[PDB]
């Protein structure tokens, strides 16, 4: 074999990489054999063969990109060269495109085969379903072709933009929510895509201090990860009372241990069970859902629906993994959005004035405090924002809230204060 | 007239099979019929069934087609993807469930399953989140398509069935920047450096702006040389989390050798019963051992069972943990306590503790 | 001959009672008789009877002689001092207590009690640990003494009774140096200031050392001027601790008007039941009113009855807190969330947070 | 009236200070008139009218000032000078003389007596019983009386030396310990007195980067609140079973609800009562005494018995406040403890040589971590020294625990590693 290392990995139950590697190299060859328009015919192969000596090396050959991208735009498109390209010319340039998807991942096979016909002619033949973030992968491209794939991509029946990448907002995603989910607190899918177009000038051209990035969950179940994985994560809520189907639980009772797999399961003790009917102290209840993702046929989540923004979500670097933090209890979710949008755009006016290069949201609000993070999205402070008040009498006061003073007309009369 | 822009993705709603988007929002419960297989019934009395198979992430476009092929015949040309990249497709006819779920592993070789049942409360193991790994990336400590794959093919038999007592979600990053919810992940796989950056002078005073290289370093273990025009690394604060090379080409600090993976646990997003939790280290540091990495599927695997073998119905791992405490978690997984385990990362504040991350609060 | 040194305090062994000395480590049970009188049972069948009574901390030699006076009847010239300054006799005839109570009573007007019976589950108010305030300090927000005397004569009734469901330690520091239990007590009053350092740039040249001066601002709200040779305090990084005082005579922040108090609550040093928990600021500042100090009182009493009226027996105010949470407690006890209250202080780090600071684990 | 607002002090319940106070004048002055040699008469008047004027004032009246000690001490003496010494010539100096308090503070009538004499001869006539720290406190004399104050004290019958204070050891204090509890797991009185006296010169003469504190609870109740007012603090425990008299339980067992206040407040369900018999499995058992505090003639500490020691104990200043947390699982506490004494002495020794000016030892364990701490302790990590392992995989390696690389041997070549 030539792929000795990988060949290992097309063993074993679970479907291989290897093999979609492979197969797309021989299809790929095949149809530029036969006179097909495909100006990569061999980045797959290439890539194969990169991958191979990697395993044996044990180490990437990847190197720093080049910056690339898209007539119009600042990201998108990440450069990638490989340090092998002599050896191997084929990946010599191996750029990827980050191609925005439709809301909750949602296709119909003529909008994919148009994503294939365009990637075959301009590109490996490769691709990601999905980025993490939640993007198309368009895997390995020449500079060259970045452009006029892009044009064709703009040109299709069912058109396909590119996402974002750099420091801009990056691509927003969705979970499923009202599409398929009895659970979803308000249309994800729609105010994602309201989000994507309201601000594709923040997406395609970077101008922040780093990325921000937005997910929508349509309930506490939290299907897109949203808390961790995105600055601003709006997850779905309501206000008011679970609505329970008492004839439905007495069915659930028949077979299933309530007591134990539910009653005995709720965080905070506000749903009991006597065999006859089913109570809720709605005042005791956090909106865990464990209730409810037990009974989903008898229970549902009350009719005053909305989200909690949560903030400050991402990755360790600086200073260190976030989950976001309750920034704001309860919003309304209804087109066309503009208190969600009120709040972004205070959020990235306020950020983009004062962060320092390469500063997340997260990090900048661990600096300014939490009093002038809440000033600038125009809140006032909540109990529900800490797990507890604070453990060090350590207190900022502002000027006019002290009583008025020979000390304060001291501060006065030398300009501090 | 000029090149189209800014003109956004699909509408996703001119996207969606009739049935779906005839009862959008007016579902009235789903309900788990087999591992790959759930149920969904709408107030109109429409019922549609969402069958889904795991895939390796990367496809080619060639399998692309074929999923199409296959959503044409099954799904009247409908299909979506799930945020852990599942595939599903939609099956009105019960009757043809079968005949899909035969014919996708025939022709692409993606198997049915990835599926939980909260309410009988049995569940399966569903796919990996990962990254680029050797594959594209220029900062991997390790690989992210060969691990993932030398994992599953271990635990199979758990993506399959519902063979697990509450959920269990595996995340591997290939780097600290620990790209996807690996940070938050009840089992999560993260690449290591263990050895400092060696600057390359010449190459920082070409391509590196000094300052801003010194201040992605969290330990402060980078100053500049002015003398020099380059950076100097004080080894002892170095911790070889790689920020600096992600900065800076003259900052590599790989060693095929040293790089490996560590392996975290109890992460938790949802809210269900407790609230969402940041993954902990358990075992520092497994070697690069491609194409099949063998030590590190062993501790994955042994952790797992370890688990499952002792966990309630509901109970995922950092709940299991709540019950037990980290003695027993030590004894009962086999693993070693070592003081790398201690938290020393002192730039993080104190006061993050004290603030509500989670969506749970009282009205 | 020459002046002896290094002798230490005299040996505690040939200062004990008899029958305490008797029967050293080999005790059998306590029994809370009523409340102020602990009965003590030896394994040899030895009975003593354990008197408490609250003192002032502060003494005067003769109220001191005179208990030396009372000690010589009815504890055989024998007695102790508690870790909250209270003060404990020794009788061995029971049915001379009741004089011994009202001896003390007629003499120095020292309260029986500040007891409490865990068997049955009833709580009395014990002292206040507290430090010296406008008597001896030089740098208090607050006095101690003064407080300490006006909340107890509105306690007064929870002292001498076992009026609590369980346990409340209240506890007083003058400043930021937060001396004794302060910072892990159920309930903490906390001398803070509102106002900033004007810097005298006379008595710095003159006294203070500028570089260690500097060094001691947690927030780095102090800079060398050079000019000048003086300090310069960033008004808007100040939180105004008071630290830089304590270095320097020429940084003092008073403001009679702004200096005042916060009140802390939920703080637990005792293993039982839950682990030791730091103290949590719910009220951000109350003035000082000498002589009576009514606003600080009026709020420490309206939280100490909020909890009593609503606490399960054993349960203490921050495991009452664990039961309603914030929400409800807030409520509940009529104060307000403000801003303040949400932590800023940056420098204690995360890791704290996970280090095991508690007795409390498996073997 | 010339004292209207403390006046106001002496109405209430509960015992005056103020009363302390104006006793304490009036028959000092008394005694100086009846010829007694007593050099301070007026020295509380002078302190009565200096807290009146506090009061209408609202601040305090005590400066910063001179350093001030006893010959052959450096510690003990608190240096205080009044801002009114020219209108109130006593309380010009007006000095603390932090005194040694015996174990457990026990007391016979006689010690005290003796402490009366002197301190009426040479200072105010006020004292504290007791302070914080422990200490008895001398509260008001002159730089001139301090030694010979101090030759009598030690001339006494029964002799008292002088407490700690500055960057030293401060002086050790204890809980009641076996002198009357059943609960004690160690001698702290005995351990008290013995560090007391082995670390005399460490106490007398501060050398140290910052002071230093060492408390002793008989067992986790934690009565001297050893976790958060002292660096060290040795809190007894024990690792066998928890004895169980069977009998006694029952006696409980007839008027005690042993179901809600003892089984279900169990921290980890280790105590069950089925109306028969009690059985606790003491390896779910973490030892927080609760059940022994609610039944002690049913139940008792184990036979095995030593002492937890929790390290870095301390109020707010500079990084924060800290309850100890565990440094050492087990340690046995038997005369002449010097288990507890190596440990003690390889920290000072480190502390010296690593510490910055007023770092308090918990903040050098923050700033060079737990593995430095523990080897200079001579110790092995331990999961029972954290509440969970770390959030984050940013792990430190020792140079000896890698893999030998080309990669090392160019650390190696250069001159780093
Ligand atoms: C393509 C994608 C990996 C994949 O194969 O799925 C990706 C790949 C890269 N990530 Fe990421 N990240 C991807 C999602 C994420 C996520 C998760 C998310 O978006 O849902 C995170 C965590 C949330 C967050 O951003 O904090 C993430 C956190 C990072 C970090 C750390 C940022 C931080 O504040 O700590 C780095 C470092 C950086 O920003 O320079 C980073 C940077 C990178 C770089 C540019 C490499 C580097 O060291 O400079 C990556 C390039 C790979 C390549 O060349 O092919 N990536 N990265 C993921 C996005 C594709 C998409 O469009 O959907
Ligand atoms: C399809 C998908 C959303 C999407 O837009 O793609 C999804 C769909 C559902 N999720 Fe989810 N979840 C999806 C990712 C997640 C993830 C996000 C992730 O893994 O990155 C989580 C957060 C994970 C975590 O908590 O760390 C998530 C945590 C849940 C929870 C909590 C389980 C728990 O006990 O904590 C529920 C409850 C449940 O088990 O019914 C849930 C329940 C559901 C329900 C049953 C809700 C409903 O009424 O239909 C949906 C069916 C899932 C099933 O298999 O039973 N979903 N769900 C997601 C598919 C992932 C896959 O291929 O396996
Ligand atoms: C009197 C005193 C001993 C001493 O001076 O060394 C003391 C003595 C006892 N304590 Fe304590 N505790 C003493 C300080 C404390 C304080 C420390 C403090 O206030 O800073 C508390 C820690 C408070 C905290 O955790 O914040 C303390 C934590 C306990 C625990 C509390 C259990 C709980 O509800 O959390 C037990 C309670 C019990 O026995 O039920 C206790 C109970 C006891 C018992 C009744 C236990 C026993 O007999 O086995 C002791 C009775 C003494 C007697 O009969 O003469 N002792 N005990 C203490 C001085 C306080 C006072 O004058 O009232
Ligand atoms: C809480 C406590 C120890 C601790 O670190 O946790 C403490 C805390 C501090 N004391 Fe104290 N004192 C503590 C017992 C006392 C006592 C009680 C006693 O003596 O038994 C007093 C009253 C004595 C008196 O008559 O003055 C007391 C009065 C003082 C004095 C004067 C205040 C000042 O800062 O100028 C010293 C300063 C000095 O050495 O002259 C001081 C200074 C300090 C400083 C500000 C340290 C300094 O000089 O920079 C404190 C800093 C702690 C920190 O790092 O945040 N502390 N201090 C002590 C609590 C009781 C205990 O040990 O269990
Ligand atoms: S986050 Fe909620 S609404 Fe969205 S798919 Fe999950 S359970 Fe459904
Ligand atoms: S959603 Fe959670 S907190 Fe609410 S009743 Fe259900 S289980 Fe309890
Ligand atoms: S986790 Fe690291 S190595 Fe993997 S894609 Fe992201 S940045 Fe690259
Ligand atoms: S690898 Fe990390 S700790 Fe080391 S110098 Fe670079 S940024 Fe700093
Ligand atoms: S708490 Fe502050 S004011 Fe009170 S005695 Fe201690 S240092 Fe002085
Ligand atoms: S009061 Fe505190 S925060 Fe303010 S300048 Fe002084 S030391 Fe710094
Ligand atoms: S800490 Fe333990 S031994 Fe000491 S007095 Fe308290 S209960 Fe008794
Ligand atoms: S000492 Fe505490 S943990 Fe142990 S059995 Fe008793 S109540 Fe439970």
């Given amino acids: ?417 | 007239e000029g090149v189209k822009t800014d003109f956004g993705p699909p509408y996703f709603r001119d996207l969606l099979h009739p049935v779906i988007a005839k009862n959008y929002g007016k579902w009235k419960y789903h309900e788990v019929v087999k591992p790959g297989v759930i149920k969904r019934v709408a107030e109109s009395g429409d019922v549609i069934y969402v069958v889904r198979f795991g895939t390796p992430r990367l496809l080619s476009i060639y399998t692309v087609r074929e999923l199409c092929d296959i959503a044409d015949k099954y799904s009247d040309g409908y299909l979506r993807w799930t945020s852990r990249n599942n595939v599903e497709f939609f099956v009105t006819d019960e009757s043809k469930i079968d005949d899909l779920i035969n014919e996708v592993q025939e022709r692409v070789g993606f198997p049915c399953g990835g599926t939980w049942d909260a309410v009988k409360g049995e569940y399966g193991l569903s796919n990996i989140v990962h990254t680029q790994g050797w594959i594209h990336c220029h900062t991997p400590a390790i690989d992210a398509s060969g691990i993932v794959k030398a994992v599953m093919d271990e635990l199979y038999e758990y993506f399959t069935d519902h063979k697990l007592p509450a959920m269990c979600r595996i995340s591997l990053a290939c780097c600290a920047n620990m790209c996807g919810a690996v940070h938050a992940s009840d089992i999560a796989i993260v690449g290591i450096h263990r050895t400092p950056p060696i600057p390359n002078d010449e190459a920082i005073r070409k391509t590196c702006e000094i300052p801003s290289t010194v201040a992605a370093c969290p330990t402060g273990a980078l100053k500049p040389d002015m003398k020099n025009k380059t950076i100097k690394v004080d080894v002892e604060k170095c911790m070889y989390c790689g920020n600096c090379y992600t900065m800076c080409p003259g900052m590599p600090l790989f060693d095929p050798e040293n790089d490996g993976a560590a392996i975290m646990v109890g992460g938790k997003l949802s809210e269900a019963r407790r609230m969402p939790e940041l993954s902990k280290v358990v075992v520092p540091w497994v070697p690069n051992e491609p194409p099949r990495w063998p030590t590190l599927v062993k501790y994955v695997k042994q952790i797992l069972e370890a688990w499952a073998a002792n966990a309630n119905k509901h109970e995922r791992l950092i709940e299991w943990v709540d019950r037990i405490g980290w003695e027993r978690f030590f004894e009962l997984t086999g693993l070693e306590f070592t003081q790398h385990l201690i938290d020393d990362y002192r730039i993080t504040p104190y006061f993050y503790s004290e603030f509500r991350a989670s969506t749970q609060f009282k009205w």
Same sequence: chains 1, 4.
């Fill in chain 1, 1 to 417: 074999s030539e792929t000795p290392l990988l060949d290992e990995l097309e063993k074993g139950p679970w479907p291989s990489f290897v093999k979609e590697i492979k197969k797309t190299a021989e299809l790929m060859e095949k149809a530029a054999a036969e006179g097909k328009d495909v100006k990569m015919p061999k980045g797959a192969r290439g890539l194969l063969k990169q991958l191979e000596i990697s395993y044996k090396d044990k180490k990437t050959h990847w190197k720093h990109g080049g910056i690339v991208s898209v007539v119009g735009y600042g990201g998108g498109v990440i450069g990638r060269y490989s340090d092998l390209g002599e050896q191997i010319p084929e990946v010599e340039h191996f750029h990827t495109m980050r191609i925005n998807q439709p809301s909750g991942w949602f296709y119909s096979t003529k909008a994919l085969r148009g994503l294939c016909d365009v990637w075959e002619k301009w590109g490996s033949g490769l691709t990601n379903f999905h980025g993490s973030t939640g993007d198309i992968i368009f895997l390995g491209t020449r500079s060259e072709y970045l452009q006029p794939c892009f044009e064709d991509l703009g040109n299709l029946e069912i058109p396909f933009d590119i996402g974002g990448s750099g420091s801009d907002l990056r691509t927003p995603s969705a979970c499923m929510g009202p599409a398929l989910c009895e659970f979803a607190c308000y249309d994800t899918l729609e105010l994602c895509y309201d989000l994507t177009m309201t601000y594709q000038d923040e997406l395609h051209r970077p101008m922040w201090p780093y990325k921000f990035k937005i997910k929508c969950a349509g309930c506490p179940n939290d299907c897109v990860a949203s808390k961790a994985r995105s600055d601003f994560a709006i997850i779905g809520t309501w206000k008011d009372d679970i609505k329970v189907d008492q004839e439905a639980v007495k069915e659930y009772a028949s077979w299933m241990d309530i007591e134990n797999e539910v009653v005995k399961l709720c965080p905070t003790g506000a749903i009991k069970w006597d065999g006859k009917e089913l109570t809720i102290d709605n005042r005791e209840c956090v909106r865990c859902m464990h209730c409810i993702n037990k009974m989903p046929k008898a229970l549902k989540p009350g009719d005053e629906r909305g989200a909690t923004i949560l903030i400050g979500g991402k990755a360790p670097f600086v200073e260190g993994a976030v989950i976001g933090w309750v920034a704001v209890p309860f919003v309304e979710v209804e087109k066309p959005y503009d208190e969600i949008k009120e709040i972004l755009e205070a959020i990235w006016d306020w950020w983009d004035e004062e962060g320092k290069f390469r500063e997340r949201i997260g990090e900048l609000i661990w600096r300014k405090g939490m009093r002038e993070f809440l000033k600038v999205i125009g809140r006032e402070a909540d109990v529900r924002m800490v797990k507890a008040p604070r453990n060090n009498p350590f207190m900022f006061f502002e000027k006019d809230e002290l009583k008025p003073s020979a000390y304060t007309e001291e501060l006065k009369k030398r300009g501090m204060w």
